[PDB]
């Protein structure tokens, strides 16, 4: 068990799951940046990685 | 426009003092469904808009001016004739800048460019009050109320 997973994995596994799933997932909830003046301009996030 | 003769029918029914009875007669002349469809088209051709009340539908208001033209003062944008129609029906004194900020939830510099582009052809002829709480100005014509 210590060889496969290890003792200290309360931070490593959680941060790896963060940078693998959540850092790519929560940007899809905020991608549309439409403005008041000139109603044509936008950005759109399709990918994000560290 | 030039859809059919119903523009002339709208002029003849909007010549005098009109009410809901004029629309009763206009729906009374021909068959009802084609009249409702073509009248919806004519109201989509920059004409009088209906009024929601206890009664069914009213005109706005009594005259046949029909001057917005939607594309031609200096440039082409479908935002300016909207704001001109907002300041057509201001009422007795006028309309605030904060009131037109509150409606349509737009920016304030588009209101400033509306101010400039409509002041370029004299429709922002304002009447000034004695006090200035929130700039109760920018009525249509004639500097009429004076508080």
């Amino acid at each position: 068990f210590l060889k496969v997973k290890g003792l200290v994995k309360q931070h490593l596994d959680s941060f790896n799951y963060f940078v693998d799933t959540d850092l790519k997932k929560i940007i899809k909830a905020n991608q549309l940046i439409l403005s008041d003046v000139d109603p044509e301009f936008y950005l759109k996030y399709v990918d994000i990685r560290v | 426009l030039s859809d059919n003769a119903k523009t002339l029918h709208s002029q003849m029914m909007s010549k005098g003092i009109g009410a809901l009875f004029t629309q009763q007669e206009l729906q009374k002349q021909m068959g009802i469904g084609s009249l409702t469809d073509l009248m919806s088209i004519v109201q989509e051709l920059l004409d009088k808009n209906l009024i929601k009340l206890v009664k069914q539908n009213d005109e706005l208001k009594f005259q046949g001016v029909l001057e917005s033209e939607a594309q031609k003062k200096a440039t082409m944008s479908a935002e300016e004739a909207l704001v001109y129609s907002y300041i057509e029906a201001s009422g007795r004194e006028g309309i605030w800048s904060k009131t037109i900020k509150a409606r349509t939830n737009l920016h304030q510099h588009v209101v400033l460019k509306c101010l400039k582009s409509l002041e370029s052809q004299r429709y922002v002829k304002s009447v000034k009050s004695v006090k200035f709480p929130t700039r109760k100005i920018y009525m249509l014509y004639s500097l009429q109320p004076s508080v």
């Binding site: 439409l34 109603p39 044509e40 | 409702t36 469809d37 919806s40 088209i41 109201q43 989509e44 920059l46 808009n49 209906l50 929601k52 069914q56 539908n57 917005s68 033209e69 939607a70 594309q71 479908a78 004739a81 909207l82 129609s85 014509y141 004639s142 500097l143 009429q144 109320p145």
Partner: protein, 273 residues
């Protein structure tokens, strides 16, 4: 051949390559490269196709004798390409108008205004039309103002000497006489032709030819009416008189509205007591 480190520090490097001498400064492929193949290869290609694009624009501008209208013809052609893309990728014109009746409907058609809550709700429109690939290009060094010119036509020079023999230093008329050039570049042409030649210019100022073929070219190539000073002066006087009559009618209507408002205020004061 390919990218391989042939040799260096001894002689002309030749292990696997096509070089046979030193001083490779001219084209500057020598040893081998392994960095930025396609993104740096497809940059001079993009620059070259944009330069050929501007050259074929300069060639098309000779036919239509209106510069900025040729630019609007170019953007009309590219928006014809845009409506072709509207045919390709995709009613479709879901937009608004100058009035509130926007859609479908102006309101409900059953009994009364039913869709007024939906008609009263701009930024939802058709935009997924123009898709183009990306790059990492640049426009630095100096960008902004400039002058895109060419080696000038000798027939244009003969026409210029005939014009200056016929209708002289008349900068606006000379800019209109060549209606696909511009103003500052023909001013540089004025000082350039003022530099090198005294003889034909002195004979040109000696000539004093009357301007009829110049007006002939300016009325054919531009299709302008050129109404005379009496007709244009009468039209300007009629426009000024119509504006003065409209201003006087607006002042009289404002005075009548103020008198009606004063009468209504007196009637309200009489009805208040």
């Amino acid at each position: 051949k390919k990218v391989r480190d042939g040799e260096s520090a001894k002689y002309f490097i030749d292990e696997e390559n096509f070089t046979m001498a030193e001083l490779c400064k001219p084209n500057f492929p020598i040893g081998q490269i392994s960095e930025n193949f396609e993104k740096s290869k497809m940059a001079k290609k993009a620059k070259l196709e944009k330069r050929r694009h501007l050259r074929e624009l300069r060639m098309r501008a000779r036919q239509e004798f209106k510069p900025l209208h040729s630019l609007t013809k170019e953007e009309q052609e590219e928006e014809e390409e845009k409506r072709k893309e509207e045919r390709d990728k995709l009613e479709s014109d879901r937009k608004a108008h100058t009035a509130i009746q926007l859609k479908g409907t102006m309101a409900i058609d059953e009994e009364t205004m039913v869709v007024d809550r939906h008609k009263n709700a701009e930024n939802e429109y058709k935009e997924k039309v123009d898709e183009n690939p990306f790059a990492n290009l640049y426009n630095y060094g100096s960008y902004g103002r400039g002058s895109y010119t060419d080696p000038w036509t000798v027939e244009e020079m003969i026409k210029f000497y005939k014009a200056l023999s016929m209708w002289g230093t008349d900068f606006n008329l000379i800019s209109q006489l060549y209606p696909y050039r511009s103003r500052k570049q023909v001013k540089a042409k004025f000082v350039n032709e003022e530099k090198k030649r005294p003889i034909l210019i002195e004979l040109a100022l000696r000539s004093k030819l009357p301007p009829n073929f110049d007006e002939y070219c300016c009325e054919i190539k531009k299709n302008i009416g050129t109404v005379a000073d009496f007709n244009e002066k009468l039209i300007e006087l009629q426009n000024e008189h119509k504006h003065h009559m409209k201003e006087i009618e607006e002042a009289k209507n404002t005075a009548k509205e103020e008198d009606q408002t004063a009468q209504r205020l007196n009637d309200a004061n009489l009805n208040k007591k």
